[model samples]
Target: KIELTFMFRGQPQEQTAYKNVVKKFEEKHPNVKVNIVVTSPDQYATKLRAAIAGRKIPDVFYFNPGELRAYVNSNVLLDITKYVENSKGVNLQDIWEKGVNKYRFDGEKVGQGNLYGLPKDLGPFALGYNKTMFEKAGIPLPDKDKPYTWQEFIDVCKKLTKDTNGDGKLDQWGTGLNATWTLQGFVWSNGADWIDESKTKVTVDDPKFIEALQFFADMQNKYKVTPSIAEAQTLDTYQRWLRGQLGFFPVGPWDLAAFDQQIKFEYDLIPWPAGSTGKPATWVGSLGIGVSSMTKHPKEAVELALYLSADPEGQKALVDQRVQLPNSVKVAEEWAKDPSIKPANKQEFLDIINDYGHSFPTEYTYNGEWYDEFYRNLQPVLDGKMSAEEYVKKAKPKMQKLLDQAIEQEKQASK
Candidate 1:
């Protein structure tokens, strides 16, 4: 019997679901027992990064996309390509064809191809609003067919936010903007992405980018809607949303369980608010299982990763949490059978996958760092602390420096 080390993030699901994975894996393969360790997101990244630096990586590990890119660049992940090729009941082709095209990294279109990881259902952002709050204000929920326009969205935020208790101090927040990923939803919806689609360069200077920034920044300042920028950094969006102090989600099915448990008032998801130029598009959430680059049991890890992601039983385990949607059409269908799974929302996510959702970019493997810097600078731009010219000309190059090493690493990978 071998003890495999696994690292996972957050108290939300990492603690129990992973242990159950160990139990189930042991049931499937009698020779293995997983020594699962848990830590907060910040701590896990530190430990995982330290382990990678010293080449003391674990037997099996979990990674988000940006993290996966870094490990793949470090040459730490195993290429489990042969495992997927050899396994049965595995549908790499089907998953690949299902417009799961957004998570492609290192030119590896298939998750099991580069063998760094397998996919879980993506956690792309959607709009989750408080139904009860809207009714109280005599406002209607955002329509899917006629989603709120950018201006109306701001009005909703403005109206929803007020000192409900008539306290001298402002007691209610209409919305929240805590992180970059969520903020990106607005940028994307306006067709003003971080990178310039025309030049293939960062476009923090584009008018559309500026517009989206103003829209989100106004959540507090002009609109007097969401929490102040400072509070947003420190607070949790989900908790606030659950408390009903905030409305709208750059949310998705990934947060369903958290919202289900935490949201005291009624709530439902909405499509993104339409922007001036673009048709509404939601962000695609990605969750994939991957094999360790250094697994002594590459065969075993690959088998488990594939088994857990694309198969009926594996997808069932994830879908039950109501926190996961399937990337595989077949696996998704199988998972939808359970009454607990909110099949309607699941299908909406799938339909959006084909038409309305966008796959996140995989350029510059460390773009996550870029995303962080973007968020850091977002407030300044919104608050008029920085100009579009400054953010694009100055802040962008600084952010791009994070990928200087990645460029060299990419060249090496090609050798």
Candidate 2:
């Protein structure tokens, strides 16, 4: 007799996976009937906005770290703190605290507020390299425990970039990376970050951050180890990776399922080259469900949200797809220990989380105008048209202005 609605963004495969989960939930709670609405990522925000404006929001819905703040501020998301606290058999300590913290927000501060949502899957970006290419080049494979230093990393790239065939022109490349695709690791490994930990300041102008950016740009421009942006445009960097022409590629668990089927070469993952800090640092992704404040059945909606996110059954259901890491630290540990999983270094993802991982820039702040601008102005620098110092100097003030504006707006709304 209890009816609730859930909205999500996914491709056909993800849609199928979630639909199956809904069926499982319904069978266990025989009296509850659920409706699932799937939307493409591009169209989701518009649809969600329209739904909220019309007061026709679904009882339960999914959100990323970037979008959660707006919903919480608009009062469209229900604060399920009491429900979570009172729920029996759902251990708050059992789930990964970092995953749970992604959804917690006070009006002014993030990472320490009410729990509006909980992650069903974590998408952590890490290093994926071609084992066949490494062995063919006679270079040793990458190591998870002992990451490459910047100098050593550059030397390896030099070795990996060469003419495989007898042709005079070079065909194979050492690595593939774009600024937007690989940001935090490049910055964080150097002991710099795009923002302060509080999410209230833009710190991309720091010397260490600029150093990382310079190194990333130099990979293509100076070392000539990576493909030029123009070259990637012709064939796509990801395609180059799948073709086995590229040595190192960025991979997340979300990528493994399809990548395993497509990658012809024996491949494995390694920690990103260590910087002066000598630790692996990278960005993290999380998607979780929240209950609508407007839902008539708050209790049922809350129950459904809990079942889908923090529950072992639901975490296992999604993890079984092998497309997402478990949100539960315990389940994730077990999942990594599975011998059958490809990239025998599956445990590296957990290491990035437990040791040195930070959320993507978008995940840390609500205002992306500044962040978007940073990427927009960064291409010229990446193309060798500008120095990293000059680019950061020009972009810093503007980005910081946007951050300040957003923080000020939050303060006003909170009062």
Candidate 3:
């Protein structure tokens, strides 16, 4: 019997979906035995890197778009181009173009090269509000078709944030936003970005970028609508949201299963509040299923990757568990039309995917070291200890140096 190993990290629902698909695949193949390895999301990257360093890479594993260039350049990923092209089950055109293109690399840059991986799912990050909180505060529910301007959003948040229990201490907050994951929506909507169109120069010091970053910081420091830095150090916004203490939080498809099980109040998605553009924007994230180049069973590995990414049965299992949106466009379109799904405005996810959603800045760059550096000293700004203008001015030069190094590394890798 042949044994193939798969490694990934996910919540229970997501894990179950992967297991069920593996079972189906094994039953059909009969000669193969699959071993599954699961890890915590926070530790998965470190663990995967260690495996690669140890030369013990799993036959199939999960990776992100940001790592595609390095993995391909290192020969860590199999070039599954021929396998994907000839496969009868997966039509490349049937999947989301953005998701598929992220795994393509032509040796120099991403998006136009040979296929190295298949997307597990395309995750759209949308803004969600607590309907219960809105009604209790006597505020009208936000329009799904319309987005709030920054000031209007702040006004609503102010109304929702209060000490609900008569105890002098405040218990409820208007929003709980993490700068790492949530800042992109505000920055992009405000007509600013971390990098310029060239993708080489860091532009965090742009006036509009500073404005957006300052506004994000003000949510906690100046506006006091979110938990204070000290308060957050105790319970964290994620836990606060689970307990119904937060009015607004970022939502992604991966969050559905846990939210469905733990959340007690009514909630639904809306476009993120608008900035200067008057249009909402958020990021669409995706994880790719990559086959290791060293796998003895290349065909089987690619088949397993395809099954998880494009097979209707696998997509249905995941969708039924509420762990993700479907990988197939047809399945997703139909799924979006179903009002039975929570978040009532299921179409908003589709809207972001088909319209306003953007790839995160890190995905466009060759490496994320520079992008990660942007947040390294961000706490002082968020804590009101530093001005956003000063922070950005200092940040741009440091980020540019790292980006330049990454470009040099990329050049060496390609050669």
Candidate 4:
């Protein structure tokens, strides 16, 4: 019997979904035995790297969009173009274009070359608010079609912030956001980005970029709508959100299963608040399932990757678990229309995916060290220890150097 190893990571429900798919796949192909290696997210990357170094990579594995370039350059990923094109079961046209495209890499740029991997799921980041909290504050629900401008958003937050327990200190908060995860929305909405179109320079020092970041910092320091840093440390915003103590939070498709189970109050998604451009923006993230170039069973490995990524039954299994939005365009559209789902405004997820959603800043770059540096000393700015203008000025040169190094490395990898 042919034995194929598949390595991946996910939460329990997601794991269950993948395991169910593996069982189905094995049943159909009794001649093959598949070994599944599940890892925690925190350690999965390191382990995958170790396996790659040892040249004992799993036949199939999960990887991020950002890793596609390096993997392709290193000859670590199999070019599944012919298999994908010849597959009768999966129609490339039926899947989400954005999701499928993230896995493509040309010799130079991403999103424009031969297919290397298929998306496990396209993660659309949406803005969510506590419906119960809005009603309790007697505030009109935010318009679904029109996003709140920054000032208006802050105004609503002020009204929502209160001390419900009659305590001397504020107990309830307007929002709690992590700068790392949530800043992209604010930055993009304001028409600023970390890199220029050429993908060579870091542009955090742009006036617009500075404004967006300062606004994020001001949510904690100036507006005082979000929890204080100390308060957040005591009970992180996620816990506070679960306890119904916060009014606004960021939502992703992956959060649905947990939100369905753990959240007590009514909540629904809306467009992220707008900045100077008066447009709402957020990012869509995706993990890809790729076949190792070194696999002996390339055909079986490719089939397994295709089944996990685009098969109807596999998609249905994952959808049932509510671990993610459906990868199929038609399936997601139908799924979004069902009012039975908890998030009444499920179309917002699709809206972001089809229209306003952008890939994460670093996904376009060769390496993330430059992008990561932007956040390394960011706590000082977030904690009111430094000015946004000053912070970005100091950050721009450091980021530029790392980006330059990454560009050089990318050249060497291609060589």
Q: Using Cα atoms with residue i matched to residue i, what is each candidate's TM-score against the true structure?
A: 0.85, 0.90, 0.96, 0.96
Cα shift from native, residue 349, model 4 (Å) = 0.7
lDDT of 3 by residue, 1-415 (tens): 7899999998776777678878988987898888999887888998999999998999999998998998998889999999888877578688988889999988777898899999999999989999998998889999998999999999989888899998998899999899989999899999999999989989999999999999999999999899878899999998899899999998889889889889999999999999999989899999999999999998888888888888877677778878899888888888888888888987888899998999988887778889889999998998999999999999889999999999899888878
| lDDT per residue as tens, model 1, 274-326 | 78754777666564455567777777776666655665666556556555676
Model 2 weakest lDDT span, ten residues long: 406-415
- Please give the range of 10 consecutive residues that has the lowest summed lDDT in model 3: 11-20
Error of 2 at 274 (Å): 2.0
lDDT of 4 by residue, 1-415 (tens): 8999999998766677788889989997898789999987778988999999998989999997898998998889999988888887679778899989888877777887898999999999999999999998899998887999999999999999998888787998899988988999999999999999888989899999999999999999999999888999999998899889999998888888878778989999999999999999999989999999999998899888888889898778778878889999999999999999879999999999988999887787777889989999999999999999999999999999999998899888898
Query: Deviation in angstroms for 57 in model 4?
Result: 1.2
Tell me the lDDT of model 4 at 149. 94
**What TM-score does structure 2 among the candidates reach?**
0.90
Per-residue lDDT tens digits for candidate 2, residues 1-415, read 8898999887555777778888888998899999988897678877877888887889999876776787787887888888888886898678888788778887666688788877666677888888999999899878768889988888898899888896986789988786787866878999998788877888888999999999999998998898767788799778899899899889888776667567899888788888879887887778768899889988788888888887778767877765678877877888889988777889988887777677777666665777878988788888889999999899989999988887776666556
Displacement of the residue 194 alpha carbon in candidate 2, Å: 2.0
Highest TM-score against the true fold, candidate: 3
**Candidate 2 residue pairs that clash:** none
RMSD (Cα, Å) for all candidates, in order, is 3.4, 2.5, 1.5, 1.6
| By lDDT: ranked, best first | 4, 3, 2, 1
